[PDB]
């Protein structure tokens, strides 16, 4: 190609969006934004294929141009705006606030939250560095740069960002015993507690995570997101609480509730 691509085939789209393979030939290409293309949910999919509020792309555009959707407290009018992990989506006219959190299956789940919970979000500290004029700043996972961070904040820590003012309220250090959320790999969407962090200089660090059921799994550090201390998450969790459950029991409880 002689330049950046602008089209996305449905088969090539991220699997977790759950798009019909025969509905059309192309899928919404997320525009540039806070989150990466493969780890983002465009607003069109959320409003049409998840909430079912709109029946087609044009109706989604009509909703957006009416300025009823807010992302992180800001109005967005792009159909393919890349909303992502820990993103707050507010619909005032319908009066709901949603937090984009993966389910156990590995898919963004429609999780409704209260207003007081919608007032803040969490961000994994991807980078800390001194800017121009000797002003420290922190870059989070969603591309937010916050100046004058607390000196104790380091990489791999989590910062509680208030949406209205965009300032850090609290933070969590990355240490053993902390509650973590998996954001990648086939363990995507699971929740557990840190046990040990294995370090390899010049390589990818590995973290051992133990679930509430005592099952243990190892994951690369890049896919780990600290969300609080054990038993005290700073955000409301989706149904299932990030516990992976086998297939036989899946049959079992589906029958039981049925």
């Amino acid at each position: 190609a002689r330049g950046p691509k602008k089209h996305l085939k449905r088969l090539a789209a991220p699997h977790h969006w759950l798009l019909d393979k025969l509905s059309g030939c192309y899928a919404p290409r997320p525009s540039a934004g806070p989150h990466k293309l493969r780890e983002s949910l465009p607003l069109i999919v959320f409003l049409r294929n998840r909430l079912k509020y709109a029946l087609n792309g044009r109706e989604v555009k009509a909703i957006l141009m009416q300025r009823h959707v807010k992302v992180d407290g800001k109005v967005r009018t792009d159909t393919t705006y890349p909303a992502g992990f820990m993103d707050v989506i507010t619909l005032d006219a319908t009066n709901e606030n949603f937090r984009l959190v993966y389910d156990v299956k590995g898919r963004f789940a429609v999780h409704r939250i209260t207003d007081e919970e919608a007032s803040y979000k969490l961000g994994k500290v991807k980078k800390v560095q001194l800017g121009k004029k000797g002003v420290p700043y922190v870059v989070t996972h969603d591309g937010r740069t916050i100046r004058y961070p607390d000196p104790n904040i380091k990489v791999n820590d989590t910062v509680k960002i208030d949406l209205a003012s965009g300032k850090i309220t609290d933070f969590i250090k990355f240490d053993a015993g902390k509650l973590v959320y998996v954001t990648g790999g086939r363990n995507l969407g699971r929740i557990g507690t840190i046990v040990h962090k294995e370090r390899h200089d010049g390589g990818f660090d590995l973290v051992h995570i133990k679930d509430s059921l005592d099952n243990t799994f190892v994951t690369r550090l890049n896919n780990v997101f600290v969300i609080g201390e054990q038993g005290k998450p700073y955000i409301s969790l989706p149904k299932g609480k990030g516990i992976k459950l086998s297939i036989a029991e899946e049959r079992d409880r589906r029958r039981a509730q049925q």
């Binding site: 449905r10 025969l22 059309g24 036989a248």
Partner: protein
């Protein structure tokens, strides 16, 4: 272009179509079940072979294997639901003991014959293809329709059928009109 839509063949030609004993076997199956052609027999045989090969592969696995337990249980549930496998025989070994006749009886044609709605298997076929038979509240015109245990008690003449309480067909009212005239 749009993504492909998958397709598959539902029947396979036999290893040796020319065995005299075989030819007599399809003669029996077609004659007793009123099958139009040999392709129906081959289709049922192919489905049965797939089922029993899966059962054999599951048996080869060690007992208590999660894959074995899950998949064998699913297969037994499906076979019980369609009715080929009786309730008291819920083990993978008896699945290997199934026969083509078991599936053939569950065909809507044969069931219609047994229930007494038709005087011949061919009469059952013509009744089904002419939209006179309804399972539950819905009309089925396909002789190859497989009946479930729950569906078995709901087979009846369709509401729209002249035999099911609707007005007489075209021939009857035509004859009545000419007689009146």
């Amino acid at each position: 272009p749009r993504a492909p839509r998958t397709y598959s063949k539902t029947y396979s030609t036999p290893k040796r179509p020319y065995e005299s004993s075989r030819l007599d076997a399809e003669l029996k199956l077609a004659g007793e079940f009123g099958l139009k052609n040999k392709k129906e027999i081959y289709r049922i045989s192919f489905q049965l072979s797939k089922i029993r090969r899966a059962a054999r592969d599951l048996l080869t696995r060690d007992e208590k294997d999660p894959k074995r337990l899950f998949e064998g249980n699913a297969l037994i549930r499906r076979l019980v639901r369609v009715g080929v496998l009786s309730e008291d025989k819920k083990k993978l070994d008896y699945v290997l003991a199934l026969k083509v006749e078991d599936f053939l009886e569950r065909r809507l044609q044969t069931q219609v014959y047994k229930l007494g709605l038709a005087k011949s298997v061919h009469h059952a076929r013509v009744l089904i293809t002419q939209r006179h038979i309804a399972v539950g509240k819905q009309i089925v015109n396909i002789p190859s329709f497989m009946v479930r245990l729950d569906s078995e008690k709901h087979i009846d003449f369709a509401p729209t059928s002249p035999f099911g309480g609707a007005r007489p067909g075209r021939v009857a009212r035509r004859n009545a009109a000419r007689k009146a005239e």
